[PDB]
Amino acid sequence: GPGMGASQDDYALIHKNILHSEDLLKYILETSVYPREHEQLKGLREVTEKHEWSMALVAADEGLFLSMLLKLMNAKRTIEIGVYTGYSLLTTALALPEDGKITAIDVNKSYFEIGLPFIQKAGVEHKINFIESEALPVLDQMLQEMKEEDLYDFAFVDADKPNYANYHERLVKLVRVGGAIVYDNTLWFGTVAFPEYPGLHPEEEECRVSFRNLNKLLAADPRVEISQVSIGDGLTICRRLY
């Protein structure tokens, strides 16, 4: 109710990691990520680390992996659901060719305005069409308008976790055959490995349950082939088969 509002300090999982030690994750970042990170990504990350919802920021080693996937598959048209301050969005815009196009959807444009100066300085603002809205109505409107020529090569899903299965039903129609759908956070701080987990915030527990259900659904879905990858907070790559 009324008060000071939602803080990430009310959450139990902030300080959890899936790798063996903090030293191993720090090694990966210092050795293989920061030397390869665009200066505008570094600036965007450093401001976002000070923000009240910094827990949501995509892991930087995951960012470089998404960039690699976009280049290897020659993606040109992508969709991002869940923008926050724009780290994965700027990563994507830097990876695409000059004529690449991104549809970016987030309910809160004020977060996006934090990252927008870095996107402009990087010279890739022209690739981004940002839409301030809940994603589900936008996706349903796309399904009535988009033709086969406009299908996306790649979707990154990093928004409200309990809605992922709902996003999946739209995205298997909005991404081309042979295209990729990537779901962030599918290992949810390691909590998915347990049928019950003590002391979580109600929203954290709702996400543990939803990801356990989502991971089973994706593994059984004949419309896609999958790979769940223990990078960052876990991601699942889906490739559309038909």
Ligand X SMILES: O=Cc1ccc(O)c(O)c1
Q: How far apart are CA 156 and CA 78, in angstroms?
A: 8
Q: Is 58 annotated to bind ligand?
A: yes
Q: How far apart are CA 217 and CA 84, in angstroms?
A: 27
Q: How far apart are CA 53 and CA 163, in angstroms?
A: 19
Q: What is the DSSP letter of 98?
A: T
- Which tokens sit at 18? 């899936």
Q: Taking Cα atoms as reference points, which of 182, 192, 203, 189 lies closest to residue 233?
A: 189
Q: Is 135 annotated to bind ligand?
A: yes
Nearer Cβ to its own copies, position 130 or 164? Answer: 164
Nearer Cβ to its own copies, position 31 or 120? Answer: 31
Return the H-helix or E-strand segment holding 70.
helix 60-72
Q: Taking Cα atoms as reference points, which of 164, 10, 166 lies closest to residue 82?
A: 164
Residue the block writes with tokens 């996107």: 119
Residue 83 partner contact from its own copies, ligand SAH, ligand X, none using kind-dependent CB cut-offs of 5 to 8 Å: ligand SAH
By CB under 6 A, what part of segment 16-75 binds ligand X? 55-56
Residue 55 partner contact from Mg ion, its own copies, ligand X, none using kind-dependent CB cut-offs of 5 to 8 Å: ligand X
Nearer Cβ to Mg ion, position 40 or 236? Answer: 236
Stretch touching ligand SAH by CB under 6 A, among 33-41, 54-62, 141-149, 229-237: 54-62
Residues engaged in binding its own copies (CB under 8 A) = 16-21, 23-28, 31-33, 35-36, 61, 64-65, 67-69, 71-73, 178, 180, 187, 190, 192-194, 215-216, 218-220, 225-231, 236-237, 239
Which residue from 44, 67, 77, 84 is in contact with ligand SAH, where contact means CB under 6 A?
Answer: 84
Q: What is the DSSP letter of 29?
A: I
- Which tokens sit at 66? 């998404």
Amino acid 5 reads: G
**Which residues are CB-contacts of 4 (< 8 A; sequence separation ≥ 6)?**
none
Q: Which residues bind Mg ion (CB under 5 A)?
A: 158, 184-185
User: Which positions lie near ligand SAH, rule CB under 6 A?
Assistant: 56-58, 81-84, 87-88, 105-108, 111, 134-135, 158-160
Residues that bind ligand X (CB under 6 A): 55-56, 158, 184-185, 233
Binding residues for Mg(2+), as ranges, are: 158, 184-185
